[PDB]
Write a protein that binds this ligand. Structure first.
Ligand SMILES: Nc1ncnc2c1ncn2[C@@H]1O[C@H](COP(=O)(O)OP(=O)(O)O)[C@@H](O)[C@H]1O
Ligand SMILES: Cc1ccc2c(c1)C(=O)[C@]1(O)CCN(c3ccccc3)C1=N2
Ligand code: VO4
Ligand SMILES: [Mg+2]
Ligand SMILES: [Mg+2]
Length: 703
């Protein structure tokens, strides 16, 4: 049994190493220690000091260099060192910030990235490979109760699975974290585990969905070389017997804007670089492709390569995945034509004509785009610079200037890419949709909390999703738990754990008074609105009124929201246009006539191409965002949730470098310590009257 065998890989990579005789001596010491700040302005940088004396209300301790004194009520005592490396931190004698961090630190220094914190799992990103995800590791975890085996994403996955069978109830695994923390990697481990333990081709197709979704939906940002720029909820589906019977991917809004613009050091989506690096000799000839430096949508950020990644090798993995899932050869070629066409569209350079209207003097890129898409270039040209619209009921050809022509071309590009993404997902699901499910375990992998030099509408939506997810944790851990105690009169005094995201949520998405998103939508159907009337409207409603909002004095185009994870300043530029997400009808008419079988689906299939109405306007991006979020939250309310809190060690994407201030900020806003305390102070288990404990109006409660 590898669990009891100290030579096994399990012991070597999942268990704390045996301490030596010098450590034992230290472990049986009578000395006592405190965690203190050498500099009181740096409250997250701690050292260990020996307590050398006490009064009834104070401790005196030695610093690393001088004696100091602290009130016992302000003291962060160090746990006895026998607790260092403990698998479940609810066991600590002293529950405080430096002590929790220290325990994570002891584990992380030994490459033990997983630790329990009461009822939920903490996962600290290693930023290197650790050999704990093999089939042999999978086999050790199968069927084991949580307390029987070391902390691992596989263990929580198995717990959910056994709960699904024993309770005949759908489960969810909610993996939180800021950008780069490890959500996507852990998600993939859950799916790997479930597919193995509940498995019977289908299982391979489930796994091979991922390189396809990542190639099209992930990119390098300044926070993560493999950032997910769309959120997803993966339902792994099981029959009544508990075997895997299929899977369904709900994807959420994609950051389409990245197709046409990337900040310094970032990349566009991986697929672009994969194609250009990986394509056949005259694949590149048939698609009129050169290197990335030749394309406006790839040559602006200054970064075309990611350290440690071969885009040519990745392209081969993407294509192998498309084969397994079952995209035909013609389909793959059409997918790649669309990618190449987008790059050509980006190279179109509009210029000022005789008047205010734009012209196209060089039609090389236009012609190359048109060829690969199978559309008529003259029609495309007219649709870009002279689109027809209604003025009342009259049909009037516009003549767009350079900036509008360029923005229209960008709109077409973003629509092509976002529809293609949707089509990939729909094609994947149709293959994985083979049996009506009896049960599901859903795994949620959103885009994580993120802050850049410039934060836009996408960032607000991402960060709001994260705030909502933290609120869901808070609701399940603290609010529902104490509501149960109190309805069942078990002698409980309500505790205010001080984590309530409601104010921030209401600021962003309130209905009365209207929040940010509601005011955005109102401005978006107001004919005279501009980005400046928008920001003026937000300040008018929130400045000096809402405690989570800030009108900054240093800018007239930004506003601040205090999120759980910190304040973010958002730049209002282009919000109205991003929210309305327009595309000229004449561009649609152009592409509806495509000779390509995939392009034509993107423009004629109503599930991909049609856009809902509300009254006389198309649904905004904000309303679409809200529908998707409300849909997720409704599904989650029908599941039994399990939480994994992914923690990023630093902001450099480096191994072996656990940064104090970075980690402690996360432990705090995640509610980790509060979560451990409710587990310790409360009563996790209860049963209708069955035929350190308590008696409810209808149930016995215990621990
Ligand atoms: N458990 C893991 N083992 C090895 N590397 C990991 C692990 N978790 C995260 N990483 C590394 O961190 C990167 C970012 O993690 P990811 O899961 O993509 O973050 P996100 O939370 O933004 O989805 C990964 O590409 C990988 O390099
Ligand atoms: C549940 C949910 C609902 C909407 C979402 C998300 C998740 C995301 O993670 C994103 O898919 C990540 C990017 N994003 C987005 C992109 C552009 C505009 C608005 C939101 C997101 N919207
Ligand atoms: O960088 V992550 O968007 O995948 O949170
Ligand atoms: Mg991710
Ligand atoms: Mg700024």
């Amino acid at each position: 049994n590898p669990i009891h065998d100290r030579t096994s890989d399990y012991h070597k990579y999942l268990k704390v190493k045996q301490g030596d005789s010098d450590l034992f001596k230290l472990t049986v010491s009578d000395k006592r220690y405190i965690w203190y700040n050498p500099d009181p302005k740096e409250r997250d940088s701690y050292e260990c000091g020996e307590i050398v004396s006490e009064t009834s209300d104070s401790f005196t301790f030695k610093t690393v260099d001088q004696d100091r004194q602290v009130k016992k009520d302000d003291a962060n005592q160090r746990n006895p060192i026998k607790f260092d490396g403990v698998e479940d931190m609810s066991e600590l004698s002293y529950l405080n910030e430096p002590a929790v961090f220290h325990n994570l630190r002891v584990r992380y220094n030994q490459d033990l990235i997983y630790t329990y914190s009461g009822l939920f799992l903490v996962a600290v990103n290693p930023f290197k490979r650790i050999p704990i995800y093999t089939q042999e590791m999978v086999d050790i975890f199968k069927g084991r109760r949580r307390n029987e085996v070391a902390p691992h994403i596989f263990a929580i996955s198995d717990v959910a699975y056994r709960s699904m069978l024993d309770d005949r109830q759908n489960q969810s695994l909610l993996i939180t974290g800021e950008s780069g923390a490890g959500k996507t990697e852990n998600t993939k481990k859950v799916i790997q585990y479930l597919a193995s333990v509940a498995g019977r081709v289908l299982e391979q197709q489930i796994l091979q969905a991922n390189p396809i979704l990542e190639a099209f939906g992930n990119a390098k940002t300044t926070r993560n070389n493999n950032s997910s720029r769309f959120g997803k909820f993966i339902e792994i589906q099981f029959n009544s017997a508990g075997f895997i019977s299929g899977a369904s991917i709900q994807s959420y809004l994609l950051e389409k804007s990245r197709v046409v613009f990337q900040s310094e050091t970032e990349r566009n989506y991986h697929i672009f670089y994969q194609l250009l690096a990986g394509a056949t000799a005259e694949e590149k000839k048939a698609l009129h492709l050169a290197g990335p430096e030749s394309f406006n949508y790839l040559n602006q950020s200054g970064c075309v390569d990611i350290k440690g990644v071969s885009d040519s090798e990745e392209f081969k993995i993407t294509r192998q995945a498309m084969d397994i899932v079952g995209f035909s050869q013609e389909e793959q070629m059409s997918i790649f034509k669309i990618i190449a066409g987008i790059l050509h569209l980006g190279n179109i350079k509009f210029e000022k004509g005789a008047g205010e209207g734009a012209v196209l003097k060089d039609k090389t890129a236009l012609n190359a785009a048109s060829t690969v898409f199978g559309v008529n270039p003259s029609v495309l040209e007219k649709a870009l610079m002279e689109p027809r619209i209604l003025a009342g009921r009259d049909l009037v050809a516009q003549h767009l200037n350079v900036e509008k022509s360029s923005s229209s071309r960008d709109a077409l590009v973003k629509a092509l890419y976002g529809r293609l993404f949707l089509w990939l997902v729909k094609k994947i699901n149709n293959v994985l949709c083979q049996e009506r499910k009896a049960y599901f375990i859903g795994v949620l992998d959103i885009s994580g909390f993120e802050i850049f030099k410039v934060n836009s509408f996408e960032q607000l939506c991402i960060n709001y999703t994260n705030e909502k997810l933290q609120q869901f944790f808070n609701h399940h851990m603290f609010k529902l738990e104490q509501e149960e105690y109190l309805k069942e009169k078990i002698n409980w005094t309500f505790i205010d754990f001080g984590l309530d995201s409601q104010a921030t949520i209401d600021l962003i998405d309130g209905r009365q008074p209207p929040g940010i998103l509601a005011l955005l939508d109102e401005q978006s159907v107001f004919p005279n609105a501009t980005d400046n009337t928008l920001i003026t409207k937000l300040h008018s409603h929130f400045s000096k009124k809402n405690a989570k909002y800030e009108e900054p004095r240093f800018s007239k185009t930004e506003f601040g929201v205090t999120h759980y994870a910190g304040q973010v300043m958002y730049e209002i530029q282009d919000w109205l246009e991003k929210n309305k997400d327009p595309l000229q009808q004449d561009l649609e008419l152009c592409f509806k006539d495509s000779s390509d079988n995939v392009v034509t689906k993107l423009f004629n299939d109503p599930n991909i191409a049609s856009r809902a109405k509300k009254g006389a306007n198309f649904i905004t991006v904000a309303a679409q965002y809200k529908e998707q979020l409300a849909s997720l939250m409704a599904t989650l309310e029908t599941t039994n949730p399990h939480f994994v809190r992914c923690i990023i060690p630093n902001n450099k994407q480096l191994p072996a470098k656990l940064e104090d201030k970075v980690v402690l900020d996360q432990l705090r806003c995640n509610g980790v310590l509060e979560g451990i305390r409710i587990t310790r102070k409360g009563f996790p288990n209860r049963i209708i009257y069955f035929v350190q404990y308590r008696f409810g109006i209808t149930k016995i409660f215990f621990r």
